[PDB]
Amino acid sequence: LLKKLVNHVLSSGSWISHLIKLSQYSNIPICNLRLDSMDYIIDVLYARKLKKENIVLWWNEKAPLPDHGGIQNDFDLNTSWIMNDSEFPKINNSGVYDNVVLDVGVDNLTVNTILTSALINDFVHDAFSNDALNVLRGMLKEWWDEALKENSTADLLVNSLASWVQNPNAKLFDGLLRYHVHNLTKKALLQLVNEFSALGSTIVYADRNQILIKTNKYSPENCYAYSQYMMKAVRTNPMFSYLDLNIKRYWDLLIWMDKFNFSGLACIEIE
Amino acid sequence: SVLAAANPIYGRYDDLKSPGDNIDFQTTILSRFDMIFIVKDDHNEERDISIANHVINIHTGNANAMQNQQEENGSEISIEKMKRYITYCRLKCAPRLSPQAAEKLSSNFVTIRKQLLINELESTERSSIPITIRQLEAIIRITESLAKLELSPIAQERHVDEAIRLFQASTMDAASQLSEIRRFEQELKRRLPIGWSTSYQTLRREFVDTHRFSQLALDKALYALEKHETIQLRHQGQNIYRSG
Amino acid sequence: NGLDTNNLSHQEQEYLKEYCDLITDLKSGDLVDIDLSGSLVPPSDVFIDVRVLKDAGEIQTEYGVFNLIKDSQFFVRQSDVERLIQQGYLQKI
Amino acid sequence: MFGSGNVLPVKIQPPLLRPLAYRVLSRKYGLSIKSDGLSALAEFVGTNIGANWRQGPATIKFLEQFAAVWKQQERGLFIDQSGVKEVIQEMKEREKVEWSHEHPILDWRDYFKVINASQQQRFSYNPHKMQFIFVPNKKQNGLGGIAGFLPDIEDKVQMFLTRYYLTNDRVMRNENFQSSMSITPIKNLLGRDAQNFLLLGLLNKNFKGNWSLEDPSGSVEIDISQTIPTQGHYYVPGCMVLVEGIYYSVGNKFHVTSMTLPPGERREITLETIGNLDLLGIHGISNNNFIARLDKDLKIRLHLLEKELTDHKFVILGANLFLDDLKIMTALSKILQKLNDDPPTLLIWQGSFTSVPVFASMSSRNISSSTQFKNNFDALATLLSRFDNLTENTTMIFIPGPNDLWGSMVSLGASGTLPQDPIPSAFTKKINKVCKNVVWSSNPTRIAYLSQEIVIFRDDLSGRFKRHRLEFPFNLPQKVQETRKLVKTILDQGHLSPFLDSLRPISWDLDHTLTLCPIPSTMVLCDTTSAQFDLTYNGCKVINPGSFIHNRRARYMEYVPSSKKTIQEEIYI
């Protein structure tokens, strides 16, 4: 505990300087922003652009439900269905595989899904307001463009938007918004499956991060350049250009049941 | 009392084929029949495995043991006792109808005749399975027989709804067997996306009041998308949800 | 009842209840050595064989303690178990 | 109580009681005696008499009284040791009443009870048997997973038809329809072209989006262009309404001239129609073979002793009190000090105990929202430790609000299932270490105080009623008018919340608690969206405090049941 006390005393200064750097871009007072919860700055910058675009906020402080005109706290089967159902449909294909089974980690899947909403679609009662989602899509495009200039604040916003959407603690937690993002994430994952299948590669497992696919090659020494060509060809695709796909493991001979029951032979790096 | 068994004119009853082609009987003989039970084979795996186990238990002789045990249980009676009970119920009980039962019977008859209007509207040809006044007499006789099971001299309403259930299961089930459909399917698959829902009032105000199609085309094509299982109904039938 | 409430009326329920209080008042006071709700059959057989129909636990009698083990036989007096025959838990001859 | 025995008790045995067992009650009155009941009778005769049990006529008279009492209840043809215990306790109460009759000079705790929505007995109406029938509880039967919160799949079908035939009985019993017109089932209407008919129908919006009326025989579409509604009522989907008008067979529509709710009936009319059934179970419990009957002389004696006890008060706080706010904490401390001046009988505490809904957050460093709830209850117990009179002399009843922990875990503060269960016992154990007698009940709470049946309900009724009210083309202080409209609508339905299942769901197995076919003498609707009020209608008392704070003031009530009078008292915070 004395080690912890000295650690906080000698590490306060970097935290204070990070508050100053956060407040330089966030345009929020240093006392009023919460550093510990990153969703507050997301909510206030978002609501600033909503108020700029002449559209009524659903800013509700002391309840996870939105305002919606005060006619909330009434049960409906529509909002219960779109707010209750949280289920990600995994694509599982059991069996033994002699091809070089590739493990790719998918990062910023939610961000690449919600950022390219104008390309996925290429009176609805359960639909989020379209103009507010155009506002958020343009705002995330601005945040991603500012993140390439090594703004660590904007990097933290683009890494924290995915946790902001899932969080009911935030002021603008709307169930229609979260259901919109979740359904679009399902659509983007199925389109990623179709794009990997269009290059002659059948998947083994699909998830939010881990995706295991089966190629046409037999040995990884003949499969490394083909794997690089495949991942650069799917990075070439317009619907998936902000997707961080990184290879985690090469599997030579694999037995698959699900993610919790697998055995086989693998190598991390090719040598 | 006549109990007849028959196959269709085609080799098996085809759900793809029209019901007029399967039956070359005249409408007179189906008017005389009271239960027109059309039965099919849906090839359900649960039903196939259940019938497989049942016929296996029959052939091995274990069904002899199960029926012999269930007779001593008391839920089944043999041929002789049921035969003598048939004779006693025909020779003792001949029931009438309560006045409150007649309202339900006449109301269900005019309801199923109004449904026969809807059945014979879009096909534009006469149905091979008719519902006439003799079928009302048939449901009357079903109600009186349901009273004659338990030696009840009054056929109450509890027997009436079971008679209505039997008639809907037999005869109403038997009788219920171009650009608008494809244009509706394309417009609705483009209109609402995968995983989102639309109220029926929105479709009524935008697809009937617009006169994009007819209301009958909407009612037929919603069922057509329901049986294709890509677009289903939820929330008491007031929401149309794309399953995807 | 001296020795199903749906079909009766409330006035018939209170009629039956107050008639039950009357017939349990009749055997008290005078006429107490006999029971008015007792068996109308003559006791032409003073001892009978009795078979138990249902399990009703351990019961008492006048000077001894009886068991109601299901499917058991007693060689007992008709008057000792006549009420229990009327309840239907005992049934033989 | 009992007469005084001079000599000390002895432990006499079932031996040597053998001639004094079968002759005195088993032959004279026809009641079989089991071994455990005989042992309990021997123990109690020993404690009553002592050594003179062999030659004492008091033993014979007490056994005759035992057989007589077992003849009025008819709880069984046998004699049970637990049954002997219940008869002995009822005899202690009986001779306490008889001693009060001998010298004019019981206890209120002997008859007062609290019934949750889960503990209430189930009743269902059958017009094929033409009356009520009681259903035994299935909470003990089967696995606790099957029994708890898993109702049968037919009960959703049976719920609204049960409400329909209850409403049909309540409208057939009224003098207006034993006179004006008669009710025709809806299925008979199609075919009768251009004839006037009067209906009772469940009001609904169908799949087409039009208005419809439904009965167990079917449904018909209506239109509301020509309606002249009865002023003073509320109309929401889910109402079962009387509809007078003309059916037309051209488009299968029903043109409504006038619409109204069925008229109400008083409480004693309902109990004489049912035949004085003890619905709450103030005397024993109802079984399958025998149904429990409320005695008339018992009811008169409870009314007399209720009028004797005049100092009993019911202190009701305003609902929606937030345990996390410090000003609410200070105001609660002041009003509990004012209640520490004089402790009441019951202190029913209610409302949304926390301001924010309790949800599964994603801040693991901070204390959780449920941990905040537990700390708030611990602070409440710390404040209650300061006041000895409330924890010694006053029992408290806890009613859940719409925003409490247990129900709004998945509803997230919204409308959820209507029978909201009580606050969990593991989250508030320190309160159980402070209060002498505290009952955590469900959101519909049926408390039986002597001959009085009281229903406690916490719901924002007026906002939902005003939001989904039936709007018409063709259509005196305002708060009083809306108050009478709300109370007349709720009592004319005979239901706490007569909304559709889409508007507010009801758990299927427990709807009889929310069904108000026996109209209570006094119920407390707690509606923060409406102002405070107190009215009587149709032999019922409906009282409402609203929110806890209204312009820097804490509002509470003192309700005496003897003169049936409520004093509204506010405290300037």
Side-chain angles (χ1 to χ4, degrees):
Chain A
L1 188 152
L2 299 176
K3 193 88 73 179
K4 190 153 299 179
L5 276 163
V6 176
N7 204 47
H8 295 285
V9 162
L10 302 192
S11 298
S12 54
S14 180
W15 278 342
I16 291 159
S17 300
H18 186 231
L19 301 183
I20 300 149
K21 178 163 179 93
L22 202 44
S23 299
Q24 271 289 6
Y25 176 64
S26 66
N27 207 356
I28 301 299
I30 186 168
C31 306
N32 294 118
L33 58 84
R34 294 153 206 131
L35 159 72
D36 62 299
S37 302
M38 202 45 257
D39 309 330
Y40 194 30
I41 296 169
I42 301 299
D43 291 331
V44 296
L45 268 66
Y46 190 47
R48 276 191 180 128
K49 201 170 278 192
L50 277 296
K51 187 191 272 310
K52 271 200 167 186
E53 293 319 292
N54 202 28
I55 192 66
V56 176
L57 292 175
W58 51 98
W59 174 279
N60 202 31
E61 303 93 359
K62 317 275 218 291
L65 281 163
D67 278 338
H68 292 309
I71 62 170
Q72 204 34 60
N73 294 318
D74 287 17
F75 194 88
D76 200 295
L77 267 76
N78 282 327
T79 184
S80 197
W81 160 256
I82 64 185
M83 174 145 163
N84 189 359
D85 203 359
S86 183
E87 183 178 1
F88 208 73
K90 56 178 77 174
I91 315 294
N92 198 5
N93 294 117
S94 304
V96 74
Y97 301 124
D98 62 357
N99 304 58
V100 186
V101 176
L102 294 184
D103 221 329
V104 298
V106 188
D107 211 2
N108 304 0
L109 167 68
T110 309
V111 176
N112 187 211
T113 302
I114 191 167
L115 182 61
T116 71
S117 161
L119 292 183
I120 298 179
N121 275 296
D122 292 332
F123 63 94
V124 182
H125 284 46
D126 289 336
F128 185 60
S129 296
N130 297 324
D131 305 63
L133 195 143
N134 296 115
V135 161
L136 189 153
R137 166 214 56 187
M139 211 185 188
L140 183 63
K141 186 71 176 67
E142 179 175 2
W143 286 350
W144 183 262
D145 287 330
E146 283 315 292
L148 266 295
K149 298 318 157 284
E150 295 205 0
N151 193 0
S152 64
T153 288
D155 189 358
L156 183 62
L157 321 173
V158 65
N159 297 326
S160 179
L161 189 150
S163 184
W164 165 69
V165 172
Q166 305 301 310
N167 202 1
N169 201 290
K171 313 298 181 289
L172 273 76
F173 170 67
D174 189 317
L176 284 75
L177 193 148
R178 183 172 56 81
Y179 183 50
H180 205 104
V181 181
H182 180 40
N183 196 20
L184 281 189
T185 312
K186 293 180 182 179
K187 291 194 183 199
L189 186 71
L190 293 199
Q191 194 65 31
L192 180 53
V193 175
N194 290 318
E195 270 291 331
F196 266 38
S197 180
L199 312 174
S201 300
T202 300
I203 63 170
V204 175
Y205 192 74
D207 217 0
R208 299 169 66 83
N209 200 327
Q210 159 187 0
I211 282 183
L212 274 164
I213 62 170
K214 180 217 65 174
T215 183
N216 49 2
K217 253 69 158 186
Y218 292 164
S219 57
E221 63 185 1
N222 294 316
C223 183
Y224 171 58
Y226 182 76
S227 74
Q228 293 280 357
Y229 197 108
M230 208 194 317
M231 65 180 288
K232 191 51 70 166
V234 72
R235 284 152 171 206
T236 309
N237 184 277
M239 283 73 74
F240 314 118
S241 176
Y242 310 93
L243 213 48
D244 281 3
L245 293 175
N246 62 6
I247 51 172
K248 295 188 289 183
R249 198 162 28 191
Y250 279 70
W251 288 86
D252 165 59
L253 191 63
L254 186 134
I255 302 185
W256 194 249
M257 202 159 263
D258 47 349
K259 65 174 49 151
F260 299 112
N261 289 298
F262 64 101
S263 169
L265 185 147
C267 53
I268 301 299
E269 56 178 359
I270 188 167
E271 205 69 29
Chain B
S1 61
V2 186
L3 182 62
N7 300 0
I9 303 299
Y10 290 86
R12 52 145 301 159
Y13 191 73
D14 263 348
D15 49 17
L16 61 84
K17 198 64 60 59
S18 74
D21 292 303
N22 288 120
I23 303 167
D24 291 331
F25 284 0
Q26 289 179 359
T27 78
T28 63
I29 204 60
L30 282 72
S31 65
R32 298 213 191 291
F33 277 127
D34 289 26
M35 301 325 188
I36 316 160
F37 263 104
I38 292 189
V39 289
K40 297 178 290 294
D41 274 358
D42 307 304
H43 293 64
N44 195 5
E45 193 93 359
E46 293 179 353
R47 196 174 167 80
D48 297 312
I49 208 67
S50 309
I51 297 169
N53 295 317
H54 198 210
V55 177
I56 275 165
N57 281 305
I58 289 155
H59 275 243
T60 54
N62 303 9
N64 295 100
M66 293 183 286
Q67 301 161 0
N68 275 298
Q69 173 253 310
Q70 270 168 246
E71 166 90 354
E72 314 179 5
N73 189 359
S75 195
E76 289 101 318
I77 60 172
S78 80
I79 295 176
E80 302 158 47
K81 194 177 309 182
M82 184 177 177
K83 184 177 313 183
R84 218 157 200 84
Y85 194 65
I86 282 155
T87 305
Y88 188 43
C89 283
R90 288 166 87 82
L91 260 66
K92 192 202 181 66
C93 182
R96 67 187 289 104
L97 264 58
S98 70
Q100 298 145 49
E103 276 307 282
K104 292 169 53 74
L105 261 175
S106 67
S107 309
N108 178 253
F109 186 64
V110 64
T111 307
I112 63 175
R113 286 275 279 259
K114 194 156 53 57
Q115 287 278 130
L116 197 56
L117 277 296
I118 301 299
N119 291 352
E120 277 183 51
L121 271 175
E122 72 269 11
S123 193
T124 305
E125 325 293 328
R126 314 288 322 274
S127 160
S128 308
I129 312 188
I131 295 92
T132 64
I133 303 108
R134 197 182 304 153
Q135 313 294 85
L136 179 52
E137 311 260 19
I139 310 171
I140 288 156
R141 281 172 218 111
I142 295 149
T143 311
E144 300 200 347
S145 175
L146 283 162
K148 269 171 75 159
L149 316 167
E150 59 211 70
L151 293 180
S152 180
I154 294 286
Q156 287 137 357
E157 298 90 50
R158 185 181 99 269
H159 292 171
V160 168
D161 54 278
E162 182 75 19
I164 301 312
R165 163 178 178 279
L166 274 181
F167 197 77
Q168 292 179 357
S170 44
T171 312
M172 282 283 324
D173 186 74
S176 298
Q177 303 292 297
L178 174 80
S179 73
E180 42 188 7
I181 321 170
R182 183 48 178 134
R183 184 181 141 151
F184 181 76
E185 280 178 307
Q186 188 65 40
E187 205 51 63
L188 196 66
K189 282 179 75 175
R190 281 185 63 249
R191 182 67 178 171
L192 55 90
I194 293 168
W196 277 287
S197 289
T198 309
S199 294
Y200 186 86
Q201 176 75 330
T202 301
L203 289 199
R204 177 162 273 278
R205 66 169 289 274
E206 293 179 353
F207 271 58
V208 181
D209 192 61
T210 312
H211 302 306
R212 183 87 78 179
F213 307 109
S214 178
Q215 42 162 330
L216 207 73
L218 170 69
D219 298 2
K220 208 87 164 179
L222 279 168
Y223 182 76
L225 294 174
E226 150 67 357
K227 54 142 191 183
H228 210 183
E229 286 103 8
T230 186
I231 297 169
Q232 61 185 355
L233 306 185
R234 205 180 292 249
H235 316 305
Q236 293 82 18
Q238 292 154 240
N239 290 40
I240 297 89
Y241 164 66
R242 188 154 175 182
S243 70
Chain C
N1 280 5
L3 198 55
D4 295 334
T5 186
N6 189 359
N7 292 313
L8 281 72
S9 176
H10 61 291
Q11 54 189 358
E12 270 173 355
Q13 277 289 141
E14 63 95 19
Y15 181 82
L16 178 62
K17 202 69 60 150
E18 185 156 79
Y19 194 51
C20 282
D21 313 299
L22 160 58
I23 62 170
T24 195
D25 212 347
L26 280 170
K27 29 199 191 169
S28 48
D30 210 0
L31 275 57
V32 63
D33 290 332
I34 77 174
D35 54 354
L36 272 300
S37 62
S39 57
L40 275 297
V41 65
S44 55
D45 219 324
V46 62
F47 292 95
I48 53 174
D49 291 331
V50 181
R51 193 187 312 285
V52 187
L53 275 184
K54 304 167 56 58
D55 198 297
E58 190 159 297
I59 211 71
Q60 283 83 18
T61 61
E62 51 255 20
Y63 274 51
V65 180
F66 278 22
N67 293 319
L68 277 296
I69 303 168
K70 186 183 175 182
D71 291 331
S72 182
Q73 175 142 319
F74 275 112
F75 179 53
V76 295
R77 175 172 311 180
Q78 193 164 10
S79 67
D80 309 343
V81 298
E82 177 65 271
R83 186 196 57 178
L84 291 98
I85 293 188
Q86 183 62 255
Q87 313 274 310
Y89 291 164
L90 294 175
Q91 188 274 331
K92 194 69 162 313
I93 181 67
Chain D
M1 293 180 183
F2 287 162
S4 314
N6 172 59
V7 294
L8 275 74
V10 290
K11 193 179 297 178
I12 49 174
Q13 291 175 120
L16 275 296
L17 202 55
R18 307 299 295 123
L20 187 62
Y22 194 79
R23 316 181 284 102
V24 285
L25 59 91
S26 184
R27 296 195 312 120
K28 289 181 190 187
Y29 306 99
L31 300 170
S32 302
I33 313 165
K34 298 266 185 55
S35 184
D36 50 352
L38 190 72
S39 173
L41 264 180
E43 176 190 5
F44 209 66
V45 172
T47 56
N48 288 338
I49 310 298
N52 213 5
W53 73 290
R54 284 280 301 118
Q55 299 185 358
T59 298
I60 308 165
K61 294 154 189 180
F62 157 77
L63 288 196
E64 287 170 5
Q65 188 58 251
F66 175 58
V69 165
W70 209 280
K71 280 292 284 184
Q72 293 85 19
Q73 286 100 28
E74 280 203 5
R75 61 179 69 246
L77 58 93
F78 283 130
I79 286 175
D80 297 357
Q81 187 177 12
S82 58
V84 173
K85 288 168 181 185
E86 311 185 330
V87 167
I88 277 172
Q89 184 171 356
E90 189 189 306
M91 269 186 197
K92 177 80 63 208
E93 179 257 330
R94 179 71 274 172
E95 313 286 2
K96 198 58 181 180
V97 179
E98 290 199 10
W99 176 78
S100 72
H101 276 51
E102 285 153 0
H103 296 285
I105 187 176
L106 307 99
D107 196 0
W108 76 272
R109 308 185 207 82
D110 291 331
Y111 269 54
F112 162 67
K113 69 200 303 176
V114 181
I115 297 169
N116 314 335
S118 64
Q119 294 185 358
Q120 177 61 44
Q121 298 272 297
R122 203 141 161 270
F123 63 94
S124 61
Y125 197 87
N126 189 359
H128 274 58
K129 300 314 170 65
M130 283 73 74
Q131 302 274 250
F132 287 66
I133 181 170
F134 273 112
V135 180
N137 65 299
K138 291 174 70 175
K139 191 177 62 179
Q140 171 76 10
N141 175 60
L143 182 78
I146 303 169
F149 291 74
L150 281 293
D152 308 302
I153 211 66
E154 73 197 289
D155 190 359
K156 177 181 212 147
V157 176
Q158 295 277 322
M159 157 185 310
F160 269 120
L161 54 85
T162 294
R163 294 190 209 171
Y164 187 91
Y165 293 108
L166 281 183
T167 309
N168 166 59
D169 189 359
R170 298 187 56 268
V171 74
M172 268 176 35
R173 268 176 289 169
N174 200 285
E175 172 36 59
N176 293 318
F177 304 101
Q178 282 176 356
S179 307
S180 304
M181 293 177 71
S182 70
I183 286 189
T184 300
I186 303 299
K187 188 183 180 180
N188 304 355
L189 276 296
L190 61 84
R192 274 84 160 88
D193 210 356
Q195 296 159 30
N196 206 1
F197 279 89
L198 179 136
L199 317 175
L200 188 153
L202 180 135
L203 185 68
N204 193 6
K205 231 163 184 176
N206 51 7
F207 64 94
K208 280 181 178 173
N210 211 0
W211 300 112
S212 86
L213 294 175
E214 186 176 1
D215 66 348
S217 295
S219 73
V220 69
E221 316 166 272
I222 62 170
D223 54 352
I224 62 170
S225 298
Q226 209 55 254
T227 61
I228 307 168
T230 303
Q231 191 168 336
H233 273 206
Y234 272 28
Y235 308 95
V236 65
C239 284
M240 293 180 183
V241 287
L242 294 174
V243 163
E244 192 261 336
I246 306 172
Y247 177 74
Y248 294 133
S249 298
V250 171
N252 194 45
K253 264 185 176 174
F254 194 108
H255 286 47
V256 180
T257 297
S258 171
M259 198 164 38
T260 187
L261 275 299
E265 301 295 6
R266 279 165 190 172
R267 174 178 185 80
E268 61 275 58
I269 312 181
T270 304
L271 276 296
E272 62 86 20
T273 305
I274 206 169
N276 290 318
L277 276 296
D278 197 6
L279 291 148
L280 294 174
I282 207 63
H283 201 136
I285 196 66
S286 312
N287 262 356
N288 200 2
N289 287 114
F290 57 96
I291 59 172
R293 302 270 292 180
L294 171 77
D295 280 359
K296 282 199 168 183
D297 49 346
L298 165 69
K299 185 282 161 193
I300 291 177
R301 272 143 212 170
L302 294 174
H303 168 56
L304 282 189
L305 65 93
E306 180 198 314
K307 288 301 290 181
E308 286 327 292
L309 263 171
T310 79
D311 50 352
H312 276 179
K313 287 194 314 181
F314 293 167
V315 176
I316 295 296
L317 293 179
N320 196 48
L321 60 92
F322 305 132
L323 276 297
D324 50 355
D325 191 291
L326 276 191
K327 178 180 180 290
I328 288 284
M329 202 36 59
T330 303
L332 188 67
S333 181
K334 306 281 290 313
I335 187 177
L336 260 184
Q337 188 163 1
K338 211 258 187 175
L339 286 179
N340 193 63
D341 189 359
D342 194 11
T345 314
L346 294 91
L347 185 47
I348 297 169
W349 269 9
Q350 69 176 346
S352 64
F353 291 129
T354 174
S355 73
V356 295
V358 188
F359 63 93
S361 85
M362 280 85 89
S363 175
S364 68
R365 36 190 180 77
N366 203 359
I367 47 181
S368 84
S369 303
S370 66
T371 301
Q372 173 73 253
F373 207 62
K374 201 175 182 187
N375 292 318
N376 279 261
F377 280 166
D378 271 27
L380 188 60
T382 317
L383 188 153
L384 276 180
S385 306
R386 291 177 174 88
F387 289 155
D388 190 30
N389 286 323
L390 277 296
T391 185
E392 193 60 42
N393 319 116
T394 298
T395 182
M396 301 176 258
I397 302 299
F398 279 68
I399 316 292
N403 214 2
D404 272 349
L405 171 59
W406 184 258
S408 57
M409 201 45 247
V410 67
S411 315
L412 297 182
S415 291
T417 73
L418 186 51
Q420 298 268 298
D421 315 303
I423 300 102
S425 60
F427 264 90
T428 187
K429 274 309 185 213
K430 190 45 197 179
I431 292 284
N432 298 348
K433 303 166 57 180
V434 169
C435 185
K436 202 256 177 179
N437 224 337
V438 55
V439 189
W440 300 82
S441 70
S442 66
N443 205 298
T445 297
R446 328 196 66 108
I447 57 171
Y449 172 73
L450 295 174
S451 53
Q452 298 292 322
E453 160 161 17
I454 313 297
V455 166
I456 301 299
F457 191 34
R458 169 66 181 86
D459 196 15
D460 283 304
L461 286 175
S462 72
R464 250 201 305 282
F465 264 106
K466 285 180 177 37
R467 269 173 299 179
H468 315 131
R469 62 181 157 180
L470 211 55
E471 298 182 359
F472 289 141
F474 194 11
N475 204 2
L476 286 191
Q478 207 154 358
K479 48 188 44 173
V480 177
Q481 275 302 295
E482 289 172 355
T483 284
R484 310 179 166 288
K485 291 153 87 152
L486 193 42
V487 67
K488 191 175 287 184
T489 290
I490 293 293
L491 276 296
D492 276 357
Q493 298 283 166
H495 198 32
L496 276 300
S497 175
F499 299 137
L500 210 47
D501 187 81
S502 297
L503 279 75
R504 195 179 182 96
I506 295 98
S507 174
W508 298 342
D509 198 1
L510 72 165
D511 187 87
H512 49 94
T513 81
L514 303 158
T515 313
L516 188 153
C517 182
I519 286 179
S521 45
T522 298
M523 66 182 180
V524 184
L525 294 174
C526 308
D527 189 358
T528 63
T529 63
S530 189
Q532 70 179 47
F533 56 85
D534 174 326
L535 294 175
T536 175
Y537 167 66
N538 212 13
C540 172
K541 181 65 67 68
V542 172
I543 319 168
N544 190 12
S547 178
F548 190 54
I549 43 164
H550 183 197
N551 292 48
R552 320 158 174 71
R553 283 174 174 84
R555 321 161 86 185
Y556 77 111
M557 312 213 196
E558 309 176 6
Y559 167 50
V560 64
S562 65
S563 68
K564 210 193 174 187
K565 198 173 184 175
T566 300
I567 299 298
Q568 297 294 321
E569 286 289 302
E570 80 290 329
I571 295 300
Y572 182 76
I573 297 169

